[PDB]
Symmetry: C2
Subunit: 438 residues, 2 copies
């Protein structure tokens, strides 16, 4: 780790010792360096993958400081190998240029669904800038330029910023505070040149989709989500799989729901089952039947669901929106099952006590939550009733919890959680407002 | 009026011919006189500027206004024109002085706040004001650089003799036909202040305009008291006055006028308050139960009766109540008011009388007396037994109406059939997908 680097340190010292001169097979030390360099570049790729998945709501508690430290350490080994000292010279100098180019990274990625005529930010950071730049020579200027997928295989304003040192900051960065721009993918190339003969630095951003406000971004959001999720580390720019495993998809979705909604309760296997039924148009109640399936892009955002007028992602993002705006605390409190069929509800609820209810998302509309519940009398015969789905607007007028209370028929949330636990003069006759079922 | 001006313009010609003798230099050249005639015209204009200011102040409470300064400007322009000829005519030192006085007072009277600053002001909130110089086209321009005008905030004491973004040029617009200073975003970072606008040009002269009075509140709302202070001052000032004196007591007739205009401007409506309303209002303020409008006609109001004395049996003042119906109506009820579906101002007691001879399901809408910003339904219910009961349903607030509108609530109630007198509710107010429909509904007890 740092242990291997420890080796590299020990060797320089020896060749230093072996320098009197009062054989040079030690410069397999250059190889030992080269190996260490490839190694870092690998870590740098790993961090980018991590950052790409964070675009989708993955946990990214990764600082770039560790990668910097290591990079600086390798340069220190290089300088020593250089000062000590044929052909190896080309070699080390090759180590250096490689490292330097790999050290220029986008650190704050820009909005990946980006609207025109809207203010945006990105930032690029150079890991080795605290070895090669600084005060004597003027800071190199980093440009921002939008590019097509075609160009990246090789309109923005406020696109130039100096790449600057912070000794307090312990970094070299250029941050664009004030950027504005005036299915189809593109990127921002960030560009700077510097001599330490002059080298040109390029960072390519994560892919973007540019939209003009309204209408807007459901499609664009699906695209970013697919690319972020299913991308290959070493891909040719903006190429993704068309089909992916459903298990990978389910994951991607759980992370998404958590991020958007704002909750740490995710989706279960039981949720994935009802999801899978919908995406695949299947009714098996076995998680086994859906565990090793493949998903395509079409199934996800292109083929409209059976008996519906929307896609699967349109539906899913519809529930995200709804949950995020109205339902977030209810979802955290585990008051909503949410993803369950009307059909399976009937099975769960038929044997239950009168007044037992559950909360699901509407299968048939976008952004809907409905009440399903069991009604049974003294004859003992159960009937299930499904109350029409509520929307975001309906939920503004009166909240879900209020509506649940308004109803005397409703007694316990499944399974047996009392509705009251679970949910939070002068001569005038009282009037009240209650939700009412016909 | 203008007649005078023609007559002046004629006499000034008369002197020109006369001066051809052909020296008078020191019918008979008692012919100024023409100069007194000028001074008088000047007094008339000063009076007109004054009248205009009163109008603008009244508009502050929702009075009609719609007046332009352009006529006043032409009137000033003409007067300068006479002064100038008269001056030219003098080529007797009284006269040059007297005439030099005429010009002085007119120019100084000429500087005005055309667009007033907001009368209730918040700190760190941004606002607009405008000043205009009526004689600027004559006296500023091409040789000079435009005078800079200052915006300062002054006290009442200071005004008898903190804002930033506050210096603006006083420039002529030839297409604009005016000389004006516009302050687009001034920022400010029982108590009355004003904005003093200050310029100096040489012709030096110092130009001063003082705004209408302002109350600054530091958030830390309310702004109820501030608004009352501002309303009374605008209403009940004298043209005469010193900053910023107001009367303590005024006529209720005058108050009623004030309220009516306010209710319209503020609410967004052209339907005002009737005498039937004013009666009920009089009862509240004066705490008197007379049902004759005559009882209240020569009555007078004080500032105290208006915003300082807590209404009897209540926790609130009269203005506090009035301003409360205002907010409730502006927010929720404006169309309903316009459509005339609200009686509004009527007592619970008077309601029993109107309704008790009416048919079943007949109703009205009133503002609640016991609350701030409330609207209630009163209605008559009569069975086959034929005995009437009046039911007053508890009042609704603004919050309540946002949830379900008042029209929706009225509709919700099968008992309510016709709005008084005899307007059908319906005119006035106007499984699947195997889910069972749900609605919000309002229920009575
Ligand atoms: Ni109208």
């Amino acid at each position: 780790f740092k242990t291997g680097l420890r080796r590299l340190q020990h060797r320089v010292g020896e060749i230093h010792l072996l320098r009197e001169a009062l054989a040079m097979l030690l410069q397999e030390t250059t190889g030992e360096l080269e190996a260490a360099k490839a190694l870092v570049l690998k870590r740098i790729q790993i961090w980018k993958r991590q950052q790409q998945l964070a675009g989708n709501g993955a946990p990214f508690e990764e600082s770039l400081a560790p990668l910097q430290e290591r990079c600086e350490s390798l340069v220190d080994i290089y300088s020593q190998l250089q000062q000590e000292v044929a052909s190896l010279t080309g070699r080390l100098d090759e180590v250096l240029r490689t490292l330097v180019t790999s050290c220029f990274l986008v650190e704050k990625q820009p909005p990946q669904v980006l609207k025109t005529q809207t203010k945006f930010q990105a930032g690029v950071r150079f890991l080795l800038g605290l070895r090669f730049l600084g005060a004597p020579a003027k800071p190199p200027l980093v440009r921002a330029d939008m590019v097509t997928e075609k160009q990246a295989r090789e309109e923005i304003i406020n696109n130039t910023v100096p790449l600057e040192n912070s000794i307090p900051g312990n970094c070299c960065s250029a941050l664009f505070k004030n950027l504005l721009l005036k299915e189809e993918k593109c990127a921002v190339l960030f560009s700077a040149s510097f001599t330490l003969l002059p080298i040109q630095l390029q960072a390519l951003s994560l892919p973007l989709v540019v939209i003009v406000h309204g209408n807007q971004d459901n499609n664009a959001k699906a695209t970013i989500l697919w690319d972020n999720a299913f991308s290959e580390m070493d891909r040719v720019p903006f190429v993704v799989a068309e089909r992916v495993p459903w298990e990978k998809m389910c994951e991607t979705l759980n992370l998404k729901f958590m991020a958007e909604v704002g909750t740490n309760r995710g989706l279960l296997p039981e949720h994935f089952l009802f999801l899978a039924q919908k995406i695949f148009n299947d009714n098996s109640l076995s998680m086994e039947a859906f565990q090793h399936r493949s998903v395509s892009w079409s199934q996800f955002n292109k083929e409209i669901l059976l008996g519906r007028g929307f896609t699967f992602w349109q539906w899913f993002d519809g529930v995200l929106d709804l949950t995020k705006r109205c339902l977030r605390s209810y979802w955290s409190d585990r008051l909503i099952i949410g993803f369950i069929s009307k059909q399976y509800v009937t099975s769960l609820l038929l044997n239950e006590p009168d007044g037992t209810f559950l909360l699901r998302f509407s299968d048939s509309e976008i952004g809907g939550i409905t009440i399903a519940h069991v009604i049974r009398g003294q004859d003992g015969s159960p009937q299930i009733e499904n109350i029409q789905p509520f929307s975001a607007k309906d939920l503004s007028i009166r909240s879900l919890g209020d509506r649940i209370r308004d109803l005397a028929q409703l007694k316990n949330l499944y399974p047996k959680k009392p509705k009251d636990e679970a949910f939070r003069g002068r001569g005038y006759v009282p009037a009240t407002i209650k939700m009412t079922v016909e």
